[PDB]
Amino acid sequence: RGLSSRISIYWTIVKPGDILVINSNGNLIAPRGYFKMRTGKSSIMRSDAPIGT
Amino acid sequence: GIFGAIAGFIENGWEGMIDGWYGFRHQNSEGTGQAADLKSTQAAIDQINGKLNRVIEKTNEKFHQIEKEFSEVEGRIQDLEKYVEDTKIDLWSYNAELLVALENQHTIDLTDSEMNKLFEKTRRQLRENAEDMGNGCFKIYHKCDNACIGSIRNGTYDHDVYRDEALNNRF
Numbered sequence: 001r002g003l004s005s006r007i008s009i010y011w012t013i014v015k016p017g018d019i020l021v022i023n024s025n026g027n028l029i030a031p032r033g034y035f036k037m038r039t040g041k042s043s044i045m046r047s048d049a050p051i052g053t
Numbered sequence: 054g055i056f057g058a059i060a061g062f063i064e065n066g067w068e069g070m071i072d073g074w075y076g077f078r079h080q081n082s083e084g085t086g087q088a089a090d091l092k093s094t095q096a097a098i099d100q101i102n103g104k105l106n107r108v109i110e111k112t113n114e115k116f117h118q119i120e121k122e123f124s125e126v127e128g129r130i131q132d133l134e135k136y137v138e139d140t141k142i143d144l145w146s147y148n149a150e151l152l153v154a155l156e157n158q159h160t161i162d163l164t165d166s167e168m169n170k171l172f173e174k175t176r177r178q179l180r181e182n183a184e185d186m187g188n189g190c191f192k193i194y195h196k197c198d199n200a201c202i203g204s205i206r207n208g209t210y211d212h213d214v215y216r217d218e219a220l221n222n223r224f
């Protein structure tokens with residue numbers, strides 16, 4: 001898509017009471033915030049099957 | 054089966070009996086008749102259902118699991134994920150095959166059992182007034198009209214009544 005360059009994606013989970021610290025002298029692609037984490041019955045599947053009512 | 058009644062000393066089944074699993078056919082002075090035995094039919098059906106309900110019961114709910122297909126060759130970890138799933142499937146496949154074999158063998162044996170039990174119950178009722186013809190038929194040595202046959206079927210037959218007559222005709 002035009003580029004010979006790349007971005008590498010990483011993740012960090014921070015539990016309550018912990019602290020995030022980000023330190024960069026450059027090349028950093030910074031987070032804009034956080035995604036809420038939940039536990040439950042959710043999951044993911046690969047399928048081409050049409051969804052139907 | 055294991056009691057030798059069904060496909061046993063009882064030659065074959067009656068396609069003509071549509072109202073029960075087990076019953077009586079009789080021939081006496083008045084004519085021929087056929088009637089289903091509902092108690093033993095029920096015994097069989099109940100057991101078979103009990104079992105059917107054991108097996109058909111609620112399945113297990115699972116949500117997020119390991120991935121079972123792969124688009125890239127990764128080596129070790131994929132080898133392991135693949136091996137685990139394959140192991141699981143082989144074991145459950147075994148459980149199912151065996152469940153069916155055992156259960157079926159037992160169903161065959163228990164239905165045979167019910168038949169034989171009805172036969173035995175009846176023979177015991179009749180006491181000295183009849184003989185086992187070996188084909189699953191009794192020979193009744195006194196005069197038995199439709200009421201009397203009925204009394205045999207609903208378990209109220211009083212042998213002492215006909216004992217003299219029958220004893221006489223047997224010997």
Ligand SMILES: *[C@@H]1O[C@H](CO)[C@@H](O)[C@H](O)[C@H]1NC(C)=O
Pocket residue numbers: 200203204207208209
């Ligand atoms: C059995 O049959 C006899 C004669 O048909 C009848 O009088 C009697 O009530 C029956 N017994 C039962 C418990 O159904």
